[PDB]
Short mmCIF file of C-alpha atoms in Angstrom, two decimals:
data_model
loop_
_atom_site.label_atom_id
_atom_site.label_comp_id
_atom_site.label_asym_id
_atom_site.label_seq_id
_atom_site.Cartn_x
_atom_site.Cartn_y
_atom_site.Cartn_z
CA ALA A 954 33.11 57.16 0.88
CA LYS A 955 32.95 60.44 3.06
CA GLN A 956 36.50 60.23 3.71
CA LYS A 957 37.35 59.45 0.12
CA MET A 958 35.16 62.38 -1.06
CA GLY A 959 36.79 64.66 1.24
CA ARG A 960 40.15 63.99 0.17
CA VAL A 961 39.12 64.05 -3.61
CA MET A 962 37.52 67.55 -3.05
CA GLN A 963 40.39 68.79 -1.44
CA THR A 964 42.58 67.65 -4.33
CA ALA A 965 40.24 68.92 -7.00
CA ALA A 966 40.16 72.39 -4.93
CA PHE A 967 43.80 72.32 -5.20
CA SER A 968 43.99 71.77 -8.87
CA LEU A 969 41.24 74.44 -9.47
CA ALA A 970 43.24 76.72 -7.58
CA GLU A 971 46.20 75.99 -9.55
CA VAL A 972 44.65 76.30 -12.81
CA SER A 973 43.10 79.83 -11.89
CA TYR A 974 46.68 80.88 -10.86
CA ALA A 975 48.07 79.91 -14.11
CA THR A 976 45.22 81.64 -16.17
CA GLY A 977 45.68 84.64 -13.93
CA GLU A 978 41.89 85.08 -13.54
CA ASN A 979 39.00 83.50 -11.70
CA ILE A 980 37.15 81.43 -14.61
CA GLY A 981 34.02 81.34 -12.42
CA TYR A 982 32.19 83.85 -14.57
CA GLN A 983 33.15 82.10 -17.84
CA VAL A 984 31.72 78.95 -16.53
CA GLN A 985 28.59 80.67 -15.38
CA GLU A 986 28.01 82.21 -18.82
CA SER A 987 28.83 78.75 -20.48
CA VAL A 988 26.21 76.86 -18.35
CA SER A 989 23.56 76.72 -21.23
CA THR A 990 23.69 72.75 -20.71
CA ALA A 991 25.29 69.97 -18.26
CA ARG A 992 27.56 68.03 -19.99
CA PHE A 993 27.35 65.34 -17.02
CA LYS A 994 23.86 63.61 -16.17
CA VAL A 995 22.65 61.09 -13.69
CA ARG A 996 20.16 58.69 -14.22
CA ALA A 997 18.62 56.83 -11.30
CA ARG A 998 18.81 53.08 -11.52
CA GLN A 999 16.39 50.51 -9.29
CA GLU A 1000 18.93 48.01 -7.79
CA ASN A 1001 17.53 45.31 -6.03
CA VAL A 1002 19.47 44.89 -2.92
CA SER A 1003 18.27 42.09 -0.78
CA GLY A 1004 14.67 42.45 -0.13
CA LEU B 357 -3.71 -8.55 17.30
CA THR B 358 -4.67 -12.01 18.45
CA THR B 359 -3.05 -13.48 15.56
CA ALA B 360 -0.19 -11.24 15.73
CA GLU B 361 0.38 -12.59 19.20
CA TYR B 362 0.02 -16.19 18.21
CA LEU B 363 2.55 -15.87 15.30
CA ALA B 364 4.94 -13.86 17.08
CA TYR B 365 4.92 -15.41 20.75
CA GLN B 366 3.61 -19.09 19.91
CA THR B 367 5.53 -19.43 16.72
CA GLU B 368 8.62 -17.24 17.09
CA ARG B 369 8.41 -15.00 14.11
CA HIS B 370 8.55 -11.28 13.93
CA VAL B 371 4.95 -9.77 12.77
CA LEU B 372 4.56 -6.08 12.02
CA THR B 373 0.97 -6.05 12.28
CA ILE B 374 -0.60 -2.93 9.93
CA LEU B 375 -3.49 -1.87 11.14
CA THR B 376 -5.76 0.78 9.03
CA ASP B 377 -7.97 3.56 9.47
CA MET B 378 -7.77 3.73 13.24
CA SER B 379 -10.20 6.56 12.94
CA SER B 380 -12.78 4.35 11.23
CA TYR B 381 -12.03 1.82 14.30
CA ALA B 382 -12.78 5.00 16.75
CA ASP B 383 -15.97 5.84 14.85
CA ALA B 384 -16.86 2.27 15.54
CA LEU B 385 -16.30 2.57 19.13
CA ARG B 386 -18.23 5.56 18.90
CA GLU B 387 -21.25 3.74 17.31
CA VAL B 388 -21.17 0.65 20.03
CA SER B 389 -20.39 2.99 22.86
CA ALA B 390 -23.65 5.05 22.21
CA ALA B 391 -25.45 1.75 21.56
CA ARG B 392 -25.57 1.44 25.26
CA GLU B 393 -26.74 4.55 27.26
CA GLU B 394 -23.19 5.74 27.55
CA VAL B 395 -22.98 9.67 27.38
CA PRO B 396 -20.45 10.78 24.69
CA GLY B 397 -17.07 12.07 25.58
CA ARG B 398 -14.89 14.89 24.20
CA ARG B 399 -15.87 14.95 20.72
CA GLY B 400 -18.35 11.94 20.71
CA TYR B 401 -15.61 9.40 21.17
CA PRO B 402 -16.01 7.58 24.68
CA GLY B 403 -13.95 8.55 27.75
CA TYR B 404 -12.15 5.02 27.25
CA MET B 405 -11.47 5.54 24.01
CA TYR B 406 -7.92 5.77 25.98
CA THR B 407 -8.06 2.59 27.33
CA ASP B 408 -9.52 0.68 24.12
CA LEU B 409 -6.52 1.94 22.00
CA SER B 410 -4.41 1.37 24.77
CA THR B 411 -5.06 -2.40 24.63
CA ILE B 412 -5.41 -2.50 20.78
CA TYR B 413 -1.45 -0.94 20.73
CA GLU B 414 -0.03 -2.58 23.72
CA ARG B 415 -0.95 -5.62 22.42
CA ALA B 416 2.36 -5.56 20.62
CA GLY B 417 6.13 -5.39 21.53
CA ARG B 418 8.78 -7.88 22.06
CA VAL B 419 8.97 -10.42 25.04
CA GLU B 420 11.56 -11.93 26.86
CA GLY B 421 11.05 -15.78 26.86
CA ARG B 422 9.95 -15.73 22.93
CA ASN B 423 12.27 -14.81 19.88
CA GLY B 424 9.47 -13.15 18.09
CA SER B 425 8.11 -9.48 18.22
CA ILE B 426 5.00 -7.51 17.02
CA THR B 427 5.23 -3.94 15.47
CA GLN B 428 2.23 -1.99 14.68
CA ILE B 429 1.61 0.74 12.00
CA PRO B 430 -1.83 1.84 12.87
CA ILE B 431 -2.05 4.00 9.71
CA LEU B 432 -4.23 6.42 11.45
CA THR B 433 -6.54 9.30 9.75
CA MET B 434 -6.85 12.34 10.94
CA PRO B 435 -10.67 13.57 10.37
CA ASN B 436 -9.89 17.39 9.57
CA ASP B 437 -6.01 17.06 9.63
CA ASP B 438 -5.99 18.19 13.26
CA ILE B 439 -3.41 16.70 15.45
CA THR B 440 -5.49 17.83 18.47
CA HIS B 441 -8.18 15.64 17.39
CA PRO B 442 -8.81 12.90 20.44
CA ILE B 443 -7.84 10.03 18.32
CA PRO B 444 -4.53 11.30 17.22
CA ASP B 445 -3.86 12.74 20.69
CA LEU B 446 -4.33 9.62 22.33
CA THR B 447 -2.76 7.34 19.76
CA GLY B 448 0.24 9.74 20.22
CA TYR B 449 0.00 9.14 23.59
CA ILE B 450 0.20 5.28 23.79
CA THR B 451 2.34 4.96 20.73
CA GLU B 452 5.98 5.63 20.34
CA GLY B 453 6.33 7.75 17.58
CA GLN B 454 4.22 9.32 14.29
CA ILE B 455 5.09 9.27 10.53
CA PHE B 456 3.26 12.01 8.98
CA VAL B 457 1.26 12.02 5.49
CA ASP B 458 1.56 15.66 4.24
CA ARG B 459 -1.22 17.11 2.15
CA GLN B 460 1.48 19.75 0.61
CA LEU B 461 3.58 16.67 -0.28
CA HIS B 462 0.79 15.04 -2.08
CA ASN B 463 -0.19 18.05 -3.67
CA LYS B 464 3.04 18.59 -5.22
CA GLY B 465 2.91 14.99 -6.18
CA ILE B 466 5.43 13.21 -4.05
CA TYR B 467 4.98 9.60 -3.23
CA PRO B 468 4.84 8.75 -0.73
CA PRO B 469 3.92 12.07 0.80
CA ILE B 470 5.66 11.49 3.98
CA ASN B 471 6.45 14.80 5.90
CA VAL B 472 9.83 14.29 7.51
CA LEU B 473 9.85 17.67 9.77
CA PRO B 474 7.24 16.58 11.94
CA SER B 475 7.70 12.77 11.83
CA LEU B 476 9.81 10.81 14.08
CA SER B 477 10.64 7.45 15.55
CA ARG B 478 10.99 7.40 19.11
CA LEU B 479 13.05 4.23 19.11
CA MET B 480 15.14 5.50 16.33
CA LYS B 481 18.33 5.12 18.50
CA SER B 482 17.68 1.32 18.59
CA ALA B 483 16.89 0.38 15.26
CA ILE B 484 19.74 2.72 13.84
CA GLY B 485 22.94 0.83 15.18
CA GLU B 486 26.03 -1.08 14.05
CA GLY B 487 25.26 -4.78 13.94
CA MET B 488 21.93 -3.76 12.69
CA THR B 489 21.47 -1.66 9.55
CA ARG B 490 24.98 0.25 8.83
CA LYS B 491 27.12 2.25 11.21
CA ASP B 492 26.19 5.72 9.32
CA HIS B 493 22.51 5.29 9.83
CA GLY B 494 22.04 7.57 12.74
CA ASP B 495 24.22 10.34 11.80
CA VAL B 496 23.01 10.44 7.91
CA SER B 497 19.29 10.72 9.60
CA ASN B 498 20.04 13.46 11.89
CA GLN B 499 22.19 15.20 9.09
CA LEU B 500 19.35 14.74 6.40
CA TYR B 501 16.99 16.11 9.05
CA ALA B 502 18.96 19.28 9.74
CA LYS B 503 19.59 20.02 6.32
CA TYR B 504 16.09 19.54 5.23
CA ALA B 505 14.57 21.85 7.84
CA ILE B 506 17.34 24.20 6.47
CA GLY B 507 16.09 23.86 3.13
CA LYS B 508 12.40 24.61 3.87
CA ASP B 509 13.89 27.79 5.65
CA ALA B 510 15.75 28.87 2.96
CA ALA B 511 12.84 28.09 0.47
CA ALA B 512 10.53 30.28 2.64
CA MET B 513 13.16 33.01 2.76
CA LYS B 514 13.81 33.31 -0.99
CA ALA B 515 11.03 34.84 -1.78
CA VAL B 516 11.37 37.25 1.00
CA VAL B 517 15.07 38.12 0.40
CA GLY B 518 15.73 37.09 -3.31
CA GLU B 519 17.55 34.13 -4.45
CA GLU B 520 20.71 36.04 -4.78
CA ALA B 521 21.08 37.32 -0.99
CA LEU B 522 21.11 33.58 0.42
CA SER B 523 24.10 32.29 1.51
CA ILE B 524 26.08 29.25 -0.26
CA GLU B 525 24.72 27.01 2.76
CA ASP B 526 21.37 28.15 1.56
CA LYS B 527 21.78 27.78 -2.21
CA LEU B 528 23.16 24.42 -1.43
CA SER B 529 20.22 23.51 0.82
CA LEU B 530 18.03 24.46 -1.60
CA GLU B 531 19.24 22.19 -4.19
CA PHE B 532 19.32 19.48 -1.65
CA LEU B 533 15.42 20.12 -0.73
CA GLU B 534 14.80 19.53 -4.52
CA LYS B 535 17.22 16.62 -4.84
CA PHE B 536 15.40 15.26 -1.53
CA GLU B 537 11.79 15.84 -2.34
CA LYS B 538 11.98 14.72 -5.83
CA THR B 539 14.47 11.87 -5.47
CA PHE B 540 14.65 10.55 -2.06
CA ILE B 541 11.20 10.66 -0.52
CA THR B 542 9.88 10.50 -4.08
CA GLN B 543 9.80 6.55 -4.27
CA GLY B 544 8.01 4.72 -6.76
CA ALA B 545 4.90 2.36 -5.28
CA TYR B 546 6.60 -0.70 -6.53
CA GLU B 547 10.37 -0.05 -5.99
CA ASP B 548 11.93 -1.86 -3.13
CA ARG B 549 14.68 0.53 -1.43
CA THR B 550 16.84 -1.82 1.11
CA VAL B 551 17.86 0.29 3.92
CA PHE B 552 21.52 0.02 2.81
CA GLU B 553 20.47 1.36 -0.77
CA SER B 554 18.49 4.10 0.77
CA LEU B 555 21.36 5.09 2.99
CA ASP B 556 23.72 5.07 -0.32
CA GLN B 557 21.20 7.59 -1.91
CA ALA B 558 21.00 9.58 1.15
CA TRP B 559 24.67 9.76 1.01
CA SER B 560 24.76 10.70 -2.86
CA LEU B 561 22.53 13.65 -1.86
CA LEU B 562 24.82 14.51 1.02
CA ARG B 563 27.35 14.77 -1.35
CA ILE B 564 26.52 17.92 -2.79
CA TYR B 565 27.55 19.77 0.34
CA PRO B 566 30.94 20.35 1.07
CA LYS B 567 32.44 17.67 3.59
CA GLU B 568 33.01 20.91 5.86
CA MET B 569 29.43 21.64 5.86
CA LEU B 570 28.02 18.52 7.09
CA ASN B 571 28.17 19.20 10.42
CA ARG B 572 26.03 16.47 12.29
CA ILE B 573 28.12 13.80 10.72
CA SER B 574 30.90 12.33 12.93
CA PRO B 575 34.56 12.94 11.23
CA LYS B 576 35.15 9.21 11.11
CA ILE B 577 31.75 8.69 9.21
CA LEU B 578 32.82 11.46 6.88
CA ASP B 579 36.19 10.01 6.25
CA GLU B 580 34.43 6.36 5.51
CA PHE B 581 31.41 7.26 3.64
CA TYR B 582 31.77 10.93 1.95
#
């Protein structure tokens, strides 16, 4: 999973760079401004693995 | 034992003497020994209780010239369920095996509540043969013992590592343990299971396992009986 996450992070960084180049400016300021709430949330699940 | 010795040796018939409450007999030995000025021994029983039990037991056995045998089932009682007690210890010493009746099995309601794991017949190899009983007796007995021990271990481990995390050979072993305690060991007090019928029931129990799982059975016996 660490190897896969590294590969996926590299791909996402390349995609973000391409998107920024297409837009002509950094969308970081806009993303920070539109940070009122999070669209993605994580809920913990207590799975019983072995004992 | 004198009646058994007569019948067997001067009448040529197999006896199977069944003594009961050898613990009561040893208590009687204690009472008679202390009738004299004899000092009590380890736990009140006399020092010669080994000799007395040895006589009582070794009054049995097969002999050469006579076509008759004497077999003994002393049906001993443990006072405090202690194998370390002098009566069970000596009786074990003189005798040639042990059949354990278990409080746990009795409380679970299984009759007869005989616990296989500690029980063994020291001359099992002689009784379980080809001409006598059936040709699969020894292998089936060994396989049943192995799978019963594995079932007890899996029952202990189920409440520790969950039922799901147990192996396939452990889930099958739990199923075998249930079908073994509740169907094989559990025998009605008035139903007669001949050795061949009990062997067939044992094979029916062993058939839940795949043929590869039964490791202790010889391949020829697996091919013939499974």
